[PDB]
Assembly symmetry: D2
Homo-oligomer: 237 residues x 4
């Protein structure tokens, strides 16, 4: 079916589905129940930034979130990754809301991936960055409450005119253009993703979170992937 491997920004502790006691960031492998996690003191009204890294060589999944003047969080997961995801995949981001609400916003999106080896010493690459999210991307793959064109930012969840974010939405955005993290002569595969985030929230118990993931090409939003589930996980934790 539809598979995914992503890094989640869980501001809402959902201990039910083995979700911890506090808002955190975790690496989900085909599962919402992160394989690893790290306490994450969210910052209401502040601009954040998250970074991911992984080597075909080292075979490790690391990510780090942060805000200025503030101390950061670190978490890593050891994963070959070649047996999980396909040679050819797609990249995107998302976040859901259901019982409560919250803004789920990214002002910037930078993406680069490289493939090497082939001792041919050529290398094959794709990189790219955003910041002014106009209306009608075209190279953008928006699905759900996802919207574009408000203030040159990309807002994934439902928010009202004044600024009355809704809680029943789920936003998913993926690049129209695929990626390649394989290659026969593949003896080195690298990719780095780093996007900005502005997470407000009236309620003192913000929800439900934000992430980043890869997935099929014919990938579609989960049906009841609202709130925790994350809008990437098909239901069954």
């Amino acid at each position: 079916a539809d598979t995914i491997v992503a890094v989640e920004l869980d501001t809402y502790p959902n201990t039910d589905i083995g979700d911890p006691s506090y808002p955190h960031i975790g690496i989900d492998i085909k599962s919402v129940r992160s394989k690893k996690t790290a306490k994450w003191n969210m910052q209401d009204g502040k601009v954040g930034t998250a970074h991911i890294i992984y080597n075909s060589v080292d075979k490790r999944l690391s990510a780090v979130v942060s805000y200025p003047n503030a101390d950061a969080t670190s978490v890593s997961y050891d994963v070959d990754l070649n047996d999980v995801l396909p040679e050819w995949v797609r990249v995107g981001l998302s976040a859901s809301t259901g019982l409560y609400k919250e803004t789920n916003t990214i002002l910037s999106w930078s993406f680069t991936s490289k493939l090497k080896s082939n001792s041919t010493h050529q290398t094959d690459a794709l990189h790219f960055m955003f910041n002014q999210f106009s209306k009608d991307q075209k190279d953008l793959i928006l699905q759900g409450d996802a919207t574009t064109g408000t203030d040159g930012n990309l807002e994934l969840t439902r928010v009202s005119s004044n600024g009355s974010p809704e809680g029943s939405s789920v936003g998913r955005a993926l690049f129209y253009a695929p990626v390649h993290i394989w290659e026969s002569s593949a003896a080195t595969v690298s990719f780095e993703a780093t996007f900005a985030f502005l997470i407000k929230s009236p309620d003192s118990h913000p929800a439900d979170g934000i992430a980043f993931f890869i997935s099929n090409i014919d990938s579609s939003i989960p049906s009841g992937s609202t709130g925790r589930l994350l809008g990437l996980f098909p239901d069954a934790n």
Copy 2:
């Protein structure tokens, strides 16, 4: 209809359609009849390389072809470009054959474009390079005699098993993913394309040429765009 603006590598002088007396390189604007040209001493059996540049600021279309130890060619055309092509376009390459034959091969494909201004000081980009053209690109947009998977190269024209290139083909390859050379807060737009080429040819009168171009999204191959026409120009010079 279908529009295009490209840089042509015409190894075959077709003076009929105002084509010069010798194999050359020219900039075609909605027309095969280059606006500018420059004598180009082709090199049979040798690896070449072509480069293009253009600034939203300077508003000039420059390209330069070359081989090692050998002297290069230069040609430029002054063109705003914002009134010709759409905000959103697609990028590709191609070449045709009809009366005669020839290989029309590129071993490498590098592409970068940047958009700036918005005094926001963010910038929005996309870059990427190829060299090992596997079978079933996916991020590749092949149309016609275009093929992939022979020796980690991209061969656009029809060539037989042994190596008996055909003469009735036309190969066009474009990136699956669109590009953006607009932007409201657009006060600077840049893009650089550079790919490799291996042009053999038994006959002492090789044909018919190779190029590079942008075009619509629903762009389709010309019908009788074989040989000179170039497989980008819809017939009517």
Copy 3:
């Protein structure tokens, strides 16, 4: 002697030395008396951004300054450049003050240059960006009132503790590491520079300006290059 070719941000009209009637930006070739200019409505207290571009091919010197929501300025000068500057040069920035005062500040510094051709299809490059200007760069070449380590910015002119900029200073900062814009097999040379600027100023007649330039390696500050002169021009307009 000491030569320079730079792009000046003249907020102070000094018509005496053929300086126009209003604060502007101009391209100085061995001379302060810009070869070209363009009205420039400075923005007190606002963050700016300036961009430069030039091709060995097109052989044109273009730059563009701007702030958000605000309209930009454009100016270009046609200059081969290979007869002016040396194969090997150095890059930097500066600004002076003498009769009046003003802050002359850059928060960010991005720099890339490429050399191509050699039909070898290799290319030789150097790029780099700054934003958090710590104390004791080392890769930084500071001379004069130039300082580093205040708020992760690079302030070139003299400013007091509270924030009482002085008017008798001149700040020049250049990369410790040289550059190369030559090459025998040189048939294409490219470089792009873009840095941020925060220009305050109590007085309603700010001074004296900011720029960007290349120069010798044994380059040294002008003696009376205070104010207009610019701290790059050796005196004699």
Copy 4:
């Protein structure tokens, strides 16, 4: 004193100094006696390519050598690195010869490093690539038998006019410009180095090897760092 941390290409098994029974690649930390190693089947007369990677986050030292059609080698060492090397360092390459001889040649040199975090979301970078090693680099830091200007390559060891490599030499080349792998707001530091190599050798027992390393700024060649030692290790294994 003079410290170094590098990746060695040991084609000569020197079991005496705990050097294995076969030509290999190993990571030397202040010591020649690699912390890790991996059998490496060298290819006489063939073009090679080596790659290194390390994250401030993952804190792992990985490198991979290879030639076309041929199977590669992998080796990694877990090393924070912040307690070993200084905030500010220099980058280079080298190789020695003493009892026997061999060419120790690199045709290409690509280098990029990034510093992030500061939740400021700016990042500070430096990248660059070579391939045509002209005479008198200037941005190059050559020491010893190191030479430049033969065929647009960088040859570090002594070789005669015809092509009669010597065996008593040692070549070290480092970038004139320093690097920065620190930063207070440092919560992510990345760098990737990849250069080409052509290792000939008449004798069926080539020697002595090639590497890559960082070190002090006032770094100087070892005195008896000929052969194994490597010309980076000060003698005392």
